[PDB]
């Protein structure tokens, strides 16, 4: 699975 940074990117998506 991807690193957690990428999950945070989705949470903050534009």
């Amino acid at each position, epitope marked *: 699975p*991807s690193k*957690r940074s990428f*999950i945070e990117d989705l949470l903050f998506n*534009k």
Partner: antibody, heavy 124, light 111 residues
Framework: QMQLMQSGAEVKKPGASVTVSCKAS????????IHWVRQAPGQGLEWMGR????????NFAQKFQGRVTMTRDMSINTAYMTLSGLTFDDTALYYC?????????????????WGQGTMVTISS | QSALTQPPSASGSPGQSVTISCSGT?????????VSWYQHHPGKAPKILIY???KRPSGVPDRFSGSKSGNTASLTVSGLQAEDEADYYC??????????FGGGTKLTVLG
């Protein structure tokens, strides 16, 4: 593990700009996300925004949108926050940090890393 | 300018428990499970104790526990010790691509 080392204290005049730097070391810089959080005297913690070091993508708090930038120099593993139009309300301790808001698919990397803080004073 | 509401102070006696609250809206505390709690001693970086409402990061003892109902999150500190005197901040994802903070609750350990 990865640590964050910030630039030293500064004083700037009202209306000017200030840049705080945040150098990563100990792990791959691009694996982390850099948030900026400040605390002004007598106030609580205040989130300013976040930056993706790889892409340079950002999100800023509505309160600072229009007079803040967050940038990076990948070649030196350094993140920057520049705050402009400074007022007395911008006198504060400024931190950069890898925050833990949403956790990973496994929890091994569910930890935070904080810089030591940079004091910025706005004065003539 | 704290978006979330926390009472300014709390207290408890050693070995006992204290619960402190953090109130938001349906677009933040009540809309997502991204509530964190930070312990802040003067002069030191904040130390996260709880994330995602209930989870603890490594090294945080189980006497710190978080919960939520509706628009209200709570932190309970049991087995209170003197070293627990600090200002406790809640945070939540919220608004539009934002992280909101409460104003902090300063905890005094009595006696």
């Amino acid at each position: 593990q990865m640590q964050l080392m910030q630039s030293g204290a500064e004083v700037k005049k009202p209306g000017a700009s200030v840049t705080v730097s945040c150098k990563a070391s100990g792990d791959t810089f691009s694996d982390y996300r850099i948030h900026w959080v400040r605390q002004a005297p007598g106030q609580g913690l205040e989130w300013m925004g976040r930056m993706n070091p790889k892409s340079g993508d950002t999100n800023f708090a509505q309160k600072f949108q229009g007079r803040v930038t967050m940038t990076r120099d990948m070649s030196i593993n350094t993140a920057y926050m520049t705050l402009s139009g400074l007022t007395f309300d911008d006198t504060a301790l400024y931190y950069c940090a890898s925050l833990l808001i949403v956790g990973g698919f496994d929890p091994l990397d569910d930890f935070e890393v904080w810089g030591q803080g940079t004091m910025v004073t706005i004065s003539s | 300018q704290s978006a979330l509401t926390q009472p300014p102070s709390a207290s408890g006696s050693p070995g006992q428990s204290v619960t402190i609250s953090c109130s938001g809206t349906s677009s933040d505390v009540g809309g997502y499970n991204f509530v964190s709690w930070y312990q802040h001693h003067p002069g030191k970086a904040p130390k996260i104790l709880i994330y995602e409402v209930t989870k603890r990061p490594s090294g945080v003892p189980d006497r710190f526990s978080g919960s939520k109902s509706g628009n209200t999150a709570s932190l309970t500190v049991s087995g209170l010790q003197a070293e627990d005197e600090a200002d406790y901040y809640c945070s939540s994802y919220g608004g539009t691509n934002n992280l909101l903070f409460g104003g902090g609750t300063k905890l005094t350990v009595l006696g």
